[PDB]
Amino acid sequence: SEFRPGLEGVPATLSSISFVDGQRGVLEYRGISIEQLAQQSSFLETAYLLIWGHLPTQQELTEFEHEIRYHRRIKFRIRDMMKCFPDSGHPMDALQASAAALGLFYSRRADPEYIRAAVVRLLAKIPTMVAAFQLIRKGNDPIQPRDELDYAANFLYMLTEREPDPVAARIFDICLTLHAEHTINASTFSAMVTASTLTDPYAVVASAVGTLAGPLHGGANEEVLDMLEAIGSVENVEPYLDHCIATKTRIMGFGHRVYKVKDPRAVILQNLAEQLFDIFGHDPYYEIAVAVEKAAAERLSHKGIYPNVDFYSGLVYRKLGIPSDLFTPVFAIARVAGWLAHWKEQLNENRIFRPTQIYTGSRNLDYTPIA
Amino acid sequence: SEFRPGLEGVPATLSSISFVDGQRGVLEYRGISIEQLAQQSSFLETAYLLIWGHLPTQQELTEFEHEIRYHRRIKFRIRDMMKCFPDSGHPMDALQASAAALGLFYSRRADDPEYIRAAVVRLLAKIPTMVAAFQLIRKGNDPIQPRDELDYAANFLYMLTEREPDPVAARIFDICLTLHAEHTINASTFSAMVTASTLTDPYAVVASAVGTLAGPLHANEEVLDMLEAIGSVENVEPYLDHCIATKTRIMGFGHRVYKVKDPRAVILQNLAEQLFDIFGHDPYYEIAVAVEKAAAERLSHKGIYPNVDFYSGLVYRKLGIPSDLFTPVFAIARVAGWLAHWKEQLNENRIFRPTQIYTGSRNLDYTPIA
Amino acid sequence: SEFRPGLEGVPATLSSISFVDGQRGVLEYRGISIEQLAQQSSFLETAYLLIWGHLPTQQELTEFEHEIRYHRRIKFRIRDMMKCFPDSGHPMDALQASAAALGLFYSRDPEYIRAAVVRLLAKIPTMVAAFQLIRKGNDPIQPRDELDYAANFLYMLTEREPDPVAARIFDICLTLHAEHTINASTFSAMVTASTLTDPYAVVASAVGTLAGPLHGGANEEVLDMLEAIGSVENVEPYLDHCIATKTRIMGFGHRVYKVKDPRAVILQNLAEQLFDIFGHDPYYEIAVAVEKAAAERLSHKGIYPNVDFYSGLVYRKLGIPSDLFTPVFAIARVAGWLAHWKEQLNENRIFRPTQIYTGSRNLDYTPIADR
Amino acid sequence: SEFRPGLEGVPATLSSISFVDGQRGVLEYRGISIEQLAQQSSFLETAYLLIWGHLPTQQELTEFEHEIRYHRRIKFRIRDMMKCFPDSGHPMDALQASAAALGLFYSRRPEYIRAAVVRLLAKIPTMVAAFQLIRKGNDPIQPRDELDYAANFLYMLTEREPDPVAARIFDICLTLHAEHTINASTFSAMVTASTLTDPYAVVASAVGTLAGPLHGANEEVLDMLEAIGSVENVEPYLDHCIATKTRIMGFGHRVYKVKDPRAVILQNLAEQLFDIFPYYEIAVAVEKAAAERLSHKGIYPNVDFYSGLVYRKLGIPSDLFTPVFAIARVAGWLAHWKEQLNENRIFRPTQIYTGSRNLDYTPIA
């Protein structure tokens, strides 16, 4: 019981956030059925139960809304510092540096407000540090938003400048709830690795944004939408499907290592995407994707995989009018709230972690300069 | 069924780059005896042994030294953006928020020999530049353009002080930094290995490394502060009584395993004695010496020796070092392990993704507003 | 995996003797509500429904009345041993060590299914007043089998003939003391009940564990605080000091009840009736003043004055010793434990569980010369 | 899971006292290889590591010896109190109720964790000895002042001093019965250990649960050994009991299944001891006959078989097994209690209600 090349699987501490059973396919968010919660709720009480531990009171919700509105403003000297940056480089590194922005912003108060205030502060702040950076990289100056819109509507208007209907708003809200949280991600793993050191929240969040990026950041669902665009026509996809079968690679958007029985996220995504394509019309790329999906369903019948939620998700992102390469910022936005709840929990534990390792080094040498 | 505390003693890897004894007071840096290396070896030779694997030859080392001097400039757009930098934050937090985008000078994401030594030399150079900058910047001083003529120790001393110092003190400081070029693999190194496998970019790596270098709310500084608060040898018995009440190891005394007068502290004490012989003994030096004699009159039999924190604070005071960045000075010394780790971290590539003890309730419902 | 730490909420068995519901303050003993069951009944019928489970007849009532009255004899060797007992101890430990050796009298099943029953039923108040007067050092006051159970207890323990109303109130209180939540008494009772050794050691361990938390009890500190009231006019200062102390209000607060468990309501009604009939004295006036002062603003918590506060007042009206309230409640507690043991005879099931081996491994023993 | 009548076998606490491995058959008392520890150890430092937790020094040993000697006497008033007991009950229950009263001696209610600890450690032996003497009726006397602990126990129980070889054997035997996994003893103890009050009611409830139904395995082992009798009837009675279809006595442990090398040490020590010291031949014949008779169950001569043998080699009282059983179990119970006291949690599990509802008072019952 002392062999772990790679140090994988050893459970660490007491889970306190979400109940999920991959074999059973049960999504009980803190014991609450994820589908049932998403059936009749909004992200407000969701995050309330996530970090605050319960859905708050009505007056509490109204006060939280008014306060988030109050702190929804923007900074000017920041824009001056922001004006001192380019508009072409690696957006992941750009946003990572943009994390340090809040560093000196309120660095002095290292309490109740230190708990209550800074949370909603980071909530109303991070979306600016992301979207304004995107606008600047696009060469577009910021605009002071109107306060008569939802936070999601606020971000949508900031990135789009249009007045939409709220059906797509509720759809995008459920979507944010979809990629919102899960069990311990490797990002969440390193977060817990740093969630105890009792230094500050800002530097932890910054290092989380940094290490959260995988190899070259990016990801798969972006490549999924890219391959959907590259699909074009699906008439020859059958020869392409056969060539890919001869290529020995995983079926795109199929067979999650944990989700293997078509976790309700994927099925709900497919159903809602069908409803949207019925309401607003189906795209020719959407038709090509549907044809490719039918061909795949008739192709293998042996992988046990299902069309992942990414099938609906890349399509919804493209149809909503979203830049292709911005997915990683959305992933960080989702992970921020989970990291917040995790750090709120971690505040209790005065664990003071420290590891130790094994040595396979040499010994008893004799040095020689100019070797 | 056991969940050991902090996974203390887990086989995360099989480290072969170094070793430590902890019983005979032997620390094997690339398997090298402390005194034998410390006799007459430049820090660059040990760095070449650690990073290049072997003590490099004359030609390649000279080429590296020339290229280092060939790349010791200060960016202009840096000072331009720096005009928007604040002037209140912690100096270590300052160094972090400063390095927050130091990598943006190159985003190649690749060549192989180049991004095995080029960004390496960039890191080896740019640190003291931004360090002395923030040092003068906090003072609101006009920035001074850099020059690679004086030795890195002497160059940094002149940059921070506008004064050419005696190089003997520079060599002593280099030796102390070698004694401080790292510690045992730290929680910094721990989180580094928690990120070192992906080999994405050394920039954010050393960034999060410096971020973790800050402890709980971010040794030598507090000990020196306590010594200054005490002052002379008149408060000896009251301080002893207060410490006995406090029931804690004497400030500047007590080690986890180095209960054998860890050789780093002994070497620091010998060097401090030589320096006080050369530089003279100050009233603070005499008072602290009397206090140390009084403490040794009580804690000799406990196997506990004065910690290197006091000697480091005394050296900084004699060097006239600002208090706010002695931790940044250590980071300048200590973060040198990042390069050797990355060189070792590049050897393998493994992904760790463990589970958690599910101490959360299993079944509940969805309450609408209740 | 998962482990709710150490016997917290896991349901044990589908027992059906009683039932407690906190939604509306429902106590269903054999499915019978307490409030209606207390109208015009005797504790004997309640004990029948509890242990025997069947409503008994008046013929058996007279028979058992004759039998138990014949079971009032005091053991002489018990008195001789008491002559060797100490003289400065704890009454609870006294009762424990006293009953600790009942096996000396009855020693070494189908017929012994009612013998020890009536035996222990009679044994309690006698030995109680015995140890009490034993502390006093006076000669014993032999009881009489012509007085009612409450009347006989009052006489023997007090050498005075009482009036009926206080005895009826005491019986009602014993009924209030009858049933509670799942008690560590009942827990350890069912625990030792798997051993199937003897009801004697069962009641023994029940007394042993039933001791107050660290030999300190809620009712003891409640009477202590009632004495600590002292003056009455300064209630506002002490109230503010305790508000600063932020403790569960002295004489207010349970662990699971916040909907006014009707036990306290009936206690308030009985206390009002008694203080109306009986002399109030300064105690009742100061208590009424302090109670009104406390109830002035504590309504923000949805609780009332605690039962133990009224228990102290009841003991004062009885002039009871401090430690007396412990066995006073223990009477009805062990009475319920009797029905618990009766139900415990149902099935044979003995646990032998495991735990989490939180330790190191592969150690070594070094020589003392080496050490 | 929890919906299992009885609710047994689930992990409960991250204990740091005992570690066992049945499949490996390795025993490590907080990391102590059983036989390897038994090679060159003494029970004193053993209990020191068990409860105190660390190996002590020699000066501590001398101080402990002097203190134990200082606190080794008994009370005459206690002896008089002992005379008041009746004489028709279980001697084990007798010893239990006897210890159940010691509170009138060192009650009180840092240093108030150690002195009464060693006092209760030295206490129960002479108490149970006088209890046995009273059950008989014969008058006992105070022990000597130069004997070893085992030597004192012998010069009390048999009122005579034997050699030290059997003393070391009994030292191993106590270590042989030193501890085990979480017993029902430990479960009930934790059930009663809630408020972390004191050893007084602790060892009390410990005994009060320690007894079993119907008033012992080693007792039943000796009964069957007497039933073994001569050589020729082993096969006939063995086949008759095979037709009876009963669990293989002297064998077949539900939990232990690797035939713990402690049992091997027991067999070897029995062989080494019987050589210096009859009916052992008849017992060995019965054992070999049963072994050749079963050959399929993997059921080997259990501990109690050799335990009764060692007791006969000492010549212990018939029901005296419960006494040694407590002498082993109670110390570990006390260590577990002292540990669990540090928790400060107060368990309070809630059961399942499957009762009736809506019942009203019958005017005629």
Residue numbers in the entry:
A (entry chain y): 5 to 114, 117 to 377
B (entry chain 1): 5 to 114, 116 to 223, 226 to 377
C (entry chain v): 5 to 112, 117 to 379
D (entry chain x): 5 to 113, 118 to 223, 225 to 286, 290 to 377
What does the paper say about this structure?
Here we report the discovery of a natural protein, citrate synthase from the cyanobacterium Synechococcus elongatus, which self-assembles into Sierpiński triangles. CS catalyses the condensation of acetyl-CoA and oxaloacetate to citrate as the first step in the tricarboxylic acid cycle. Using cryo-electron microscopy, we reveal how the fractal assembles from a hexameric building block.
We could not obtain a structure of the 54mer from wild-type SeCS because the protein tended to aggregate on the grids. Instead, we solved this structure for a point mutant (H369R), which we generated in the course of a structure–function analysis (described further below). However, the dihedral angle between dimers across the interaction is different for the two types of connection within the 54mer. That is, the interaction between 6mers is made at 60°, which is identical to the angle at which it is made in a free 18mer. By contrast, the angle between 18mers within the 54mers is 34°. This different angle is necessary because the dihedral angle of interaction between hexamers is too large across the length of an 18mer to close the triangle in a 54mer.
